[PDB]
Amino acid sequence: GSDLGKKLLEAARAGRDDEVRILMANGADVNAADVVGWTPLHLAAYWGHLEIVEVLLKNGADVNAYDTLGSTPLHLAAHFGHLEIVEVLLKNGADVNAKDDNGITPLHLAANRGHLEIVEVLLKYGADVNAQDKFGKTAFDISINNGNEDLAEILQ
Amino acid sequence: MPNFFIDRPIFAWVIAIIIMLAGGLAILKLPVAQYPTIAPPAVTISASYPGADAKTVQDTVTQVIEQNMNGIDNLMYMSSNSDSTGTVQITLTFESGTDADIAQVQVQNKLQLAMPLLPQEVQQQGVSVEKSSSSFLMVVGVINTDGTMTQEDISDYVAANMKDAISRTSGVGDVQLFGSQYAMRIWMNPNELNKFQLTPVDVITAIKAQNAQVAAGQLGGTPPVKGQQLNASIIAQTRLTSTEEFGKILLKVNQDGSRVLLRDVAKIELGGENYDIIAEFNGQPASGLGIKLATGANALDTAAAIRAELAKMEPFFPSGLKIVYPYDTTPFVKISIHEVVKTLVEAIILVFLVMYLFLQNFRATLIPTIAVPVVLLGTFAVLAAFGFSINTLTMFGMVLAIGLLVDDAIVVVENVERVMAEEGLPPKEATRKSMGQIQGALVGIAMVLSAVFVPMAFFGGSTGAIYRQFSITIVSAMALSVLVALILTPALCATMLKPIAKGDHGEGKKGFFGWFNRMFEKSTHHYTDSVGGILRSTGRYLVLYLIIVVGMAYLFVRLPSSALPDEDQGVFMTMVQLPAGATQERTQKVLNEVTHYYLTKEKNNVESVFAVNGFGFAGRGQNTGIAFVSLKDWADRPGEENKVEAITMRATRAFSQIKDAMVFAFNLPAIVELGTATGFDFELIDQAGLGHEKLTQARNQLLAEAAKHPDMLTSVRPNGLEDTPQFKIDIDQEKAQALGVSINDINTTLGAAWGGSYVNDFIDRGRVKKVYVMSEAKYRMLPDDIGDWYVRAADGQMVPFSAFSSSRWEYGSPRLERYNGLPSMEILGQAAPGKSTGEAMELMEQLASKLPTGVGYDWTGMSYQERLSGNQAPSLYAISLIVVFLCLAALYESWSIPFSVMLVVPLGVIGALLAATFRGLTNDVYFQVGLLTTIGLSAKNAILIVEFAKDLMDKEGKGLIEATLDAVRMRLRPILMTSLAFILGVMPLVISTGAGSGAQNAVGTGVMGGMVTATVLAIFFVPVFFVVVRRRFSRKNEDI
Amino acid sequence: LGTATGFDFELIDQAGLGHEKLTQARNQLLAEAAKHPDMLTSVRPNGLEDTPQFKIDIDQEKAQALGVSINDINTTLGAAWGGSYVNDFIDRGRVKKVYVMSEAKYRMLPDDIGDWYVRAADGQMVPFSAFSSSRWEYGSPRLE
Amino acid sequence: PGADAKTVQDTVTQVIEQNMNGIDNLMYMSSNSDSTGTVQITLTFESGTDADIAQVQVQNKLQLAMPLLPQEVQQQGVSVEKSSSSFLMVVGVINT
Amino acid sequence: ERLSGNQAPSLYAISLIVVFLCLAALYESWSIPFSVMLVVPLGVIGAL
Ligand SMILES: CCCCCCCCCCCCO[C@@H]1O[C@H](CO)[C@@H](O[C@H]2O[C@H](CO)[C@@H](O)[C@H](O)[C@H]2O)[C@H](O)[C@H]1O
Ligand SMILES: CCCCCCCCCC
């Protein structure tokens, strides 16, 4: 319950790159968490603030930090098409096969929204193509259900 | 007319008494209110969807209703809010002067044909259409001192045994409850439900079946058989009346033969329909009623009527139940009136003193003491004829006019006292000659004054509505004043005034009066000598006149303009805003800190705090709150330190070390039904189906550019709430079908359990109320509780939610805004110190055009009104100036001489501007009407001077210089008398610090400053104007 | 305008007392009004008096035990004894209503209740006498 | 149709009555609910009240209680009329 | 009836005052009007 921790969370969400840098120098906790378990790196990934993702990882932020439902920055980045952020997270040792409480992986979420570029990068970093969610669904199954043939070809 | 009534003094009296009677009768039966209808008429469509989120409300209710809001006349704009509490408000604002009855019915008629498209759940709650443009008369608070009743217990009694009886009280319009009547609560237990293989669906089904009112016909019903002996109603199932009866509802019979009753799977109690609002009054549980005033209803009667009707139920109340008044606008209206009446009485006894100083007899001093009151009374009868009310604007309209009404009395009585002393004619003959000189001018003055004030009424919007109150009031009183001056004051002059010896100016008297008469005679000689010298070198003073026009023009641009001044009304607001995801309990801790502070550190000033949890002006929900701070009477709050503006700043500063929660105290605006009035009101609109997330990006992009210009723009902020974490749950349709679980059973179980469901009605102590099913609190708090809930498959097995559902955190809006049927975000802000709102608006437009393609904008509220009332402002000044010229041209029978009068305008303006600029006030409506009444009175003085001068040149064939100097000598005394009486009349208004002093200061200061300069400058410049104007514009006439 | 002679008084229940207690209060006022024939004359109620009503209770347990839907019961009782507006038809080019109801002779007396059968889930026909009881009780034919 | 006084009162009359507010120039409201399944709610307005404005304000309030009424009552049609007017004549029709 | 009760006397008073003021203007006198207004009961006694 640190004041500077709450400011960083709000600052990293709105995309204040310079205010982050200042709060980092002032000694604000990089791994401060919401009520729902979101860190600044969660928010930066979700809203697509690349520089802040790079700045937070440079100041020793947990790249594999997980929320109360088991979702990581990579889950959010991969889901909502932030390709540049997916590359940076994976370059800083992000768990490519991270399972949320539903057994959903970055590859599932990327496949769900038909982000071909992100899917191909996740596969390059060794994403388990046969990984099943709690319902036994693979990325390929998701692609077939959505009628995405281009994406189905890649996972076959 | 004067000659006729000089011979018939009793006829004159009869007319005056009839006017007084008509006035006094109007005063009794006229509606009294703080303000009239200023705010443009507005109709609000209110609907609720219990359990629904902002987007569910928007996409099933708001958009559907909005798409059918067309073919409606006089619609300016439409705005809507859809929030996380399942509430929607669509506001349709109509043009000023739109029939509010016609507006409401045209909206209702369009809504009525969208009703079948709305969800049944929304229809059952009832979709109200109301006139929202009206303001709160008072708020009745209800508490239980015994501490026996909870918020829900109190709210029920107020809803079922008060709300209606209050609506029936004389002059009462709209009424809104702080809570709800009792609803029968079924608090379901998922453990017990699963244990007997049951779901919320079975509970709802069982309630509809076993809580039913059945029509069963009659014994011997029609058509009957012959010989039938008995006719009797058949009574089958009737609505349940108690928690006991609801508990006995048989859900199922087990195979072993045991019974599952509703009380075996649920807790059963009387509770609220809704729990999203917690109201407190000095920390203790409370309900209440927000009462509104009806069309042309007396506010002082309605207030007294309710207080009397509530005292009639005092014995009928249960033990402890006490009525409190945390918000009432009646006490401020009574003072606002009493203070205005005090000013009118003070002004009359001041005219009495000034009339006895100059004329020095009690017979002459009574004529203005009779004529002025007659006109004031008569005006009310005229106001009653136009359908106006006794309010702040019409009340101060008479205060601002008193100078014009007092002059009409003095001008008549003085001119008779002059003629008698100069010529030695008897009173009756002196009045005939005296009235003969002024009669024609007084009629001409009326036409000129009309042209000054009448065009002020033809302003559009809310500013025009304010202006029109002064326009009609001043013109009405002025018109009556001239009528009374041609009927009564001549008759009274002829009969009451005693004769004066020829050449007797009271310098033969002794003591103080003897000194004054000798002193003023010398002063009058010195004045004519000073003017005589000024007229021999006019050229120099025309350059001095230009310096005043330039000086005026400079002060006019430098002086900031305001709407209306802030007032201490014995109330103010404290808004509470906790961060995203903040709970009811956390918000209640902050309101308790705020409540405690006011009852502790402001114990001497504050009477009560009405804390409201779950409602704010930015939006509503668990992270928002408000506190109505009710102050003690002004009589117990002496000094500026104990005023609303001082307590406000003390509180806002005291709420700095607050435990991460935004808490600001602020005073109410003059007209609350208008809101703020300072700054601008911007709408950012999505006009290409971009989406809410992209509209936020564009909003953030605009706010960042607005922060780059602190020079021009200040406090540019969004009015709405920010996106909050939402718990998104996905149903797997395949796994649901695989397990044989109906998607309807799933969504009904989730919906009814977590959201709550309105099943049907029951009868609580003879009154129909709602039955709600919902999960008991402890089984619908956290995500892990989702797996406690089981649905029954076709095969009879119980499947948990965890089997066929996944969940994740996702951001979404707790308050979705729309403008003109498109997604919008409202942005507030103001021009920085020095800069004008017009300049600030121009910048916002240029910033808005840099935003992404598909993003547009529009102006709303006071920005829409200003942008509209701009092109008409200059034309109405031009229309006024042309008609004044044409009136003066007809009076004097000349195209040139009118200029000699119209040049006197800036002489009064320079003083007002200096006085207002010196005292650091603003260019508000009170200042602006103050200029017109100052310019009007200065113009009237110039008209009477030029009349006398022109009369002498025509009637007696005198020279230009002789006639000019004769005129200014005759017209000095009456000018200085009116000026002095009026300057003293408005002196209490300038030094006023009490209740309603904000308005009094705005009236008095500009008038006192303006009158001082107009008085001193005009007596020297008016003769200069006539001489210069007559010499330049004339053929071979004569200077001899 | 109506009558115009005399007065028009309204006695109001303002504490959820109930219809039976409002009558008691009304009777108490009319009795005191009769004690002053000097002042008041023909002080009478405008409305009707409470009449015998045939109150029928459905046993929810026995209904569920026999597999008889409470909806089938209330629809059978309602439509038969009360009558039910089903839908519209076209009589000589004009739209008019279709009503279902019991023929007079099967909805006159309490004993006729046992003539009416509802079908259970199992397909058997259950009479009203199986799952219902009845008694005489007073009630208002005109609630003001 | 088929409903008793109390069934009419507690499903129709009370529901309509609870929504009869925000109506201008209302002196008093009275209602009858009878054994023939009939309800009459009478709203009497002040002398000089515009009867057209009175009817429409009542209708508008009734219209937003209609979804709360039993389907059986809605199907029969809920009329809003100016009852203050008097009978000009009664036409009788017979078959000789 | 309960409503139209407080206004009954005032309307008689308003009528009486205005009649007096009308007669006062006609004859140009505050006294002579009384000579006319005293005739009211002469007609009333017969009707009753
Ligand atoms: C000679 C110069 C002319 C000056 C006159 C200017 C008149 C301007 C003010 C007129 C206001 C009087 O209007 C009248 O006010 C009183 C209270 O004061 C109100 O009366 C109200 O308050 C009183 C307080 O005693 C209560 O008893 C009463 O139940 C309530 O109705 C009337 O409803 C209103 O009709
Ligand atoms: C005619 C020459 C004298 C001019 C001066 C007159 C006095 C002016 C005082 C304001």
GROMACS .gro file of C-alpha atoms in nm, chain B residues 380-617:
model
  238
  536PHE     CA    1  -4.737   4.400  -0.986
  537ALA     CA    2  -5.090   4.423  -1.143
  538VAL     CA    3  -4.917   4.476  -1.487
  539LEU     CA    4  -4.672   4.185  -1.410
  540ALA     CA    5  -4.980   3.969  -1.316
  541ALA     CA    6  -5.138   4.065  -1.657
  542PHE     CA    7  -4.819   3.946  -1.846
  543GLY     CA    8  -4.812   3.624  -1.631
  544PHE     CA    9  -4.483   3.713  -1.449
  545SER     CA   10  -4.394   3.615  -1.086
  546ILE     CA   11  -4.244   3.799  -0.780
  547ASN     CA   12  -3.877   3.678  -0.809
  548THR     CA   13  -3.515   3.805  -0.760
  549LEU     CA   14  -3.507   3.948  -1.120
  550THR     CA   15  -3.849   4.131  -1.116
  551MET     CA   16  -3.778   4.242  -0.751
  552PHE     CA   17  -3.435   4.401  -0.835
  553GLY     CA   18  -3.596   4.523  -1.164
  554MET     CA   19  -3.810   4.758  -0.943
  555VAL     CA   20  -3.504   4.855  -0.724
  556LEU     CA   21  -3.312   4.952  -1.048
  557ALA     CA   22  -3.623   5.147  -1.175
  558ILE     CA   23  -3.681   5.340  -0.842
  559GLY     CA   24  -3.455   5.622  -0.981
  560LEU     CA   25  -3.692   5.663  -1.284
  561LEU     CA   26  -4.012   5.646  -1.066
  562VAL     CA   27  -3.869   5.892  -0.803
  563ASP     CA   28  -3.766   6.136  -1.088
  564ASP     CA   29  -4.124   6.145  -1.238
  565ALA     CA   30  -4.246   6.255  -0.886
  566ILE     CA   31  -3.963   6.512  -0.818
  567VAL     CA   32  -3.969   6.659  -1.178
  568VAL     CA   33  -4.347   6.742  -1.142
  569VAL     CA   34  -4.344   6.875  -0.778
  570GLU     CA   35  -4.012   7.071  -0.821
  571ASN     CA   36  -4.126   7.245  -1.147
  572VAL     CA   37  -4.449   7.370  -0.970
  573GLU     CA   38  -4.246   7.492  -0.662
  574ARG     CA   39  -4.011   7.671  -0.913
  575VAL     CA   40  -4.294   7.841  -1.118
  576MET     CA   41  -4.478   7.952  -0.795
  577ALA     CA   42  -4.156   8.106  -0.644
  578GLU     CA   43  -4.044   8.265  -0.981
  579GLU     CA   44  -4.384   8.397  -1.112
  580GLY     CA   45  -4.609   8.415  -0.796
  581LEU     CA   46  -4.901   8.214  -0.950
  582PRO     CA   47  -5.137   8.020  -0.715
  583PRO     CA   48  -5.085   7.639  -0.682
  584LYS     CA   49  -5.377   7.541  -0.918
  585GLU     CA   50  -5.265   7.790  -1.194
  586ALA     CA   51  -4.889   7.719  -1.130
  587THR     CA   52  -4.946   7.340  -1.189
  588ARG     CA   53  -5.137   7.401  -1.522
  589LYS     CA   54  -4.839   7.607  -1.659
  590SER     CA   55  -4.578   7.371  -1.496
  591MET     CA   56  -4.747   7.056  -1.644
  592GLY     CA   57  -4.782   7.245  -1.980
  593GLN     CA   58  -4.396   7.262  -2.001
  594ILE     CA   59  -4.319   6.891  -1.916
  595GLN     CA   60  -4.638   6.693  -2.022
  596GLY     CA   61  -4.518   6.652  -2.388
  597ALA     CA   62  -4.159   6.557  -2.279
  598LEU     CA   63  -4.279   6.293  -2.021
  599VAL     CA   64  -4.470   6.112  -2.306
  600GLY     CA   65  -4.161   6.144  -2.536
  601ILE     CA   66  -3.932   6.017  -2.251
  602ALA     CA   67  -4.164   5.709  -2.213
  603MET     CA   68  -4.125   5.623  -2.589
  604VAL     CA   69  -3.740   5.675  -2.565
  605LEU     CA   70  -3.706   5.468  -2.239
  606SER     CA   71  -3.924   5.193  -2.405
  607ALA     CA   72  -3.677   5.177  -2.703
  608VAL     CA   73  -3.385   5.145  -2.448
  609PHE     CA   74  -3.538   4.855  -2.241
  610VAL     CA   75  -3.788   4.672  -2.477
  611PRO     CA   76  -3.525   4.530  -2.723
  612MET     CA   77  -3.351   4.364  -2.417
  613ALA     CA   78  -3.650   4.116  -2.402
  614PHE     CA   79  -3.596   3.994  -2.767
  615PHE     CA   80  -3.262   3.824  -2.670
  616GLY     CA   81  -3.284   3.443  -2.721
  617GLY     CA   82  -3.173   3.158  -2.488
  618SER     CA   83  -3.151   3.167  -2.103
  619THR     CA   84  -2.965   3.508  -2.091
  620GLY     CA   85  -3.263   3.656  -2.287
  621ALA     CA   86  -3.507   3.491  -2.037
  622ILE     CA   87  -3.316   3.666  -1.748
  623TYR     CA   88  -3.302   4.002  -1.941
  624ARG     CA   89  -3.677   3.990  -2.035
  625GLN     CA   90  -3.767   3.986  -1.657
  626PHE     CA   91  -3.596   4.333  -1.618
  627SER     CA   92  -3.719   4.461  -1.963
  628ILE     CA   93  -4.099   4.411  -1.896
  629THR     CA   94  -4.064   4.509  -1.521
  630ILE     CA   95  -3.877   4.843  -1.586
  631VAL     CA   96  -4.095   4.938  -1.894
  632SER     CA   97  -4.420   4.851  -1.701
  633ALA     CA   98  -4.329   5.059  -1.387
  634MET     CA   99  -4.194   5.344  -1.612
  635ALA     CA  100  -4.518   5.346  -1.824
  636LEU     CA  101  -4.734   5.361  -1.502
  637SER     CA  102  -4.503   5.636  -1.354
  638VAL     CA  103  -4.577   5.865  -1.659
  639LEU     CA  104  -4.955   5.783  -1.631
  640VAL     CA  105  -4.951   5.871  -1.252
  641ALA     CA  106  -4.742   6.186  -1.339
  642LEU     CA  107  -5.018   6.306  -1.585
  643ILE     CA  108  -5.314   6.220  -1.348
  644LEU     CA  109  -5.235   6.216  -0.968
  645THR     CA  110  -4.915   6.429  -0.913
  646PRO     CA  111  -5.072   6.727  -1.103
  647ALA     CA  112  -5.399   6.697  -0.896
  648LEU     CA  113  -5.201   6.656  -0.565
  649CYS     CA  114  -4.975   6.957  -0.663
  650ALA     CA  115  -5.280   7.185  -0.732
  651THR     CA  116  -5.456   7.100  -0.397
  652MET     CA  117  -5.179   7.020  -0.136
  653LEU     CA  118  -4.898   7.275  -0.216
  654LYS     CA  119  -4.931   7.618  -0.039
  655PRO     CA  120  -4.844   7.934  -0.241
  656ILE     CA  121  -4.491   8.095  -0.247
  657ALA     CA  122  -4.418   8.475  -0.270
  658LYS     CA  123  -4.263   8.593  -0.605
  659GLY     CA  124  -3.878   8.601  -0.576
  660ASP     CA  125  -3.884   8.407  -0.241
  661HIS     CA  126  -3.613   8.131  -0.250
  662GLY     CA  127  -3.621   8.076   0.133
  663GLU     CA  128  -3.307   8.295   0.189
  664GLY     CA  129  -3.525   8.510   0.425
  665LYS     CA  130  -3.552   8.199   0.655
  666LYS     CA  131  -3.316   8.154   0.959
  667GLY     CA  132  -3.115   7.863   1.115
  668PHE     CA  133  -2.988   7.570   0.897
  669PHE     CA  134  -3.254   7.609   0.617
  670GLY     CA  135  -3.168   7.984   0.589
  671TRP     CA  136  -2.796   7.892   0.538
  672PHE     CA  137  -2.872   7.615   0.278
  673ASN     CA  138  -3.105   7.844   0.069
  674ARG     CA  139  -2.834   8.122   0.065
  675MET     CA  140  -2.563   7.853  -0.002
  676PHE     CA  141  -2.750   7.681  -0.295
  677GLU     CA  142  -2.854   8.017  -0.458
  678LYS     CA  143  -2.478   8.114  -0.465
  679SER     CA  144  -2.391   7.758  -0.593
  680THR     CA  145  -2.661   7.791  -0.871
  681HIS     CA  146  -2.516   8.136  -0.978
  682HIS     CA  147  -2.158   7.985  -0.977
  683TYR     CA  148  -2.285   7.688  -1.192
  684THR     CA  149  -2.449   7.917  -1.460
  685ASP     CA  150  -2.128   8.134  -1.458
  686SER     CA  151  -1.912   7.815  -1.498
  687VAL     CA  152  -2.136   7.687  -1.789
  688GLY     CA  153  -2.142   8.041  -1.945
  689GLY     CA  154  -1.758   8.026  -1.952
  690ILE     CA  155  -1.753   7.662  -2.085
  691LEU     CA  156  -1.991   7.762  -2.375
  692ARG     CA  157  -1.745   8.040  -2.489
  693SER     CA  158  -1.477   7.770  -2.568
  694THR     CA  159  -1.667   7.442  -2.652
  695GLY     CA  160  -1.378   7.304  -2.870
  696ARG     CA  161  -1.163   7.212  -2.562
  697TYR     CA  162  -1.447   7.013  -2.389
  698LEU     CA  163  -1.522   6.807  -2.709
  699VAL     CA  164  -1.158   6.674  -2.679
  700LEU     CA  165  -1.225   6.599  -2.304
  701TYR     CA  166  -1.547   6.416  -2.419
  702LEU     CA  167  -1.342   6.201  -2.668
  703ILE     CA  168  -1.094   6.112  -2.382
  704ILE     CA  169  -1.398   5.976  -2.181
  705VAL     CA  170  -1.524   5.767  -2.484
  706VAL     CA  171  -1.165   5.623  -2.529
  707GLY     CA  172  -1.126   5.580  -2.146
  708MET     CA  173  -1.473   5.411  -2.126
  709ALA     CA  174  -1.395   5.180  -2.426
  710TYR     CA  175  -1.064   5.074  -2.253
  711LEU     CA  176  -1.230   4.997  -1.911
  712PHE     CA  177  -1.516   4.807  -2.092
  713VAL     CA  178  -1.272   4.559  -2.264
  714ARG     CA  179  -1.055   4.524  -1.944
  715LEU     CA  180  -1.364   4.441  -1.723
  716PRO     CA  181  -1.437   4.062  -1.716
  717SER     CA  182  -1.802   3.945  -1.775
  718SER     CA  183  -1.983   3.694  -1.541
  719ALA     CA  184  -2.328   3.522  -1.565
  720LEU     CA  185  -2.465   3.607  -1.212
  721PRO     CA  186  -2.280   3.652  -0.878
  722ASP     CA  187  -2.244   3.356  -0.630
  723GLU     CA  188  -2.462   3.381  -0.312
  724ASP     CA  189  -2.450   3.229   0.041
  725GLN     CA  190  -2.784   3.033   0.022
  726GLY     CA  191  -2.729   2.846   0.357
  727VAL     CA  192  -2.621   2.526   0.167
  728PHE     CA  193  -2.321   2.389  -0.035
  729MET     CA  194  -2.206   2.052  -0.184
  730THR     CA  195  -1.909   1.818  -0.105
  731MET     CA  196  -1.848   1.557  -0.384
  732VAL     CA  197  -1.654   1.230  -0.305
  733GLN     CA  198  -1.472   1.026  -0.580
  734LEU     CA  199  -1.277   0.709  -0.476
  735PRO     CA  200  -1.059   0.533  -0.741
  736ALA     CA  201  -1.171   0.257  -0.988
  737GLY     CA  202  -1.320  -0.059  -0.825
  738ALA     CA  203  -1.368   0.119  -0.486
  739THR     CA  204  -1.652  -0.032  -0.272
  740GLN     CA  205  -1.962   0.111  -0.091
  741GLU     CA  206  -1.790   0.048   0.250
  742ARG     CA  207  -1.470   0.245   0.153
  743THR     CA  208  -1.682   0.541   0.020
  744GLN     CA  209  -1.887   0.537   0.349
  745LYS     CA  210  -1.560   0.574   0.555
  746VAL     CA  211  -1.469   0.891   0.351
  747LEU     CA  212  -1.826   1.040   0.383
  748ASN     CA  213  -1.804   0.969   0.764
  749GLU     CA  214  -1.469   1.165   0.778
  750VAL     CA  215  -1.637   1.449   0.574
  751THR     CA  216  -1.954   1.438   0.799
  752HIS     CA  217  -1.741   1.434   1.123
  753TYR     CA  218  -1.526   1.735   1.003
  754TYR     CA  219  -1.837   1.957   0.940
  755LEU     CA  220  -2.001   1.861   1.279
  756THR     CA  221  -1.660   1.924   1.454
  757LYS     CA  222  -1.433   2.192   1.290
  758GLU     CA  223  -1.741   2.384   1.152
  759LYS     CA  224  -1.972   2.310   1.454
  760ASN     CA  225  -2.069   2.685   1.481
  761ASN     CA  226  -2.161   2.719   1.106
  762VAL     CA  227  -2.302   2.371   1.003
  763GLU     CA  228  -2.652   2.250   1.115
  764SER     CA  229  -2.652   1.905   0.939
  765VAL     CA  230  -2.475   1.691   0.668
  766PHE     CA  231  -2.691   1.472   0.433
  767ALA     CA  232  -2.435   1.210   0.310
  768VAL     CA  233  -2.540   1.018  -0.010
  769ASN     CA  234  -2.330   0.705  -0.099
  770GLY     CA  235  -2.343   0.595  -0.468
  771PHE     CA  236  -2.433   0.923  -0.653
  772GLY     CA  237  -2.199   1.189  -0.804
  773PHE     CA  238  -2.229   1.460  -1.078
   0.00000   0.00000   0.00000
